[PDB]
Amino acid sequence: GSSGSSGLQQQEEETYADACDEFLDPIMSTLMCDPVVLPSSRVTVDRSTIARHLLSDQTDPFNRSPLTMDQIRPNTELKEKIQRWLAERKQQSGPSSG
Incomplete structure (x- = not known):
């Protein structure tokens, strides 16, 4: 249980304020985990x-044209880039226990 001024979670979950448009969704305007390349509009969502x-x-x-889940393909070229940034961004200054 708690002890004093503690808590599991106080609203919110994440906060990506250092991601380029390449990763940010064009509509959601948020981080993209599985960016799919639209074969119609040629947009990444x-x-x-x-x-x-x-x-x-x-x-x-x-485009507002015929499109489905089978048509859209996973943007591997982008997904691979997200793994490099998400792994590189987690650098921090360096913990200190001693």
């Missing part, structure tokens, strides 16, 4: 960001 748009109208949010 999260695999989940597109799914929400392919719920009632299976098409592109920009």
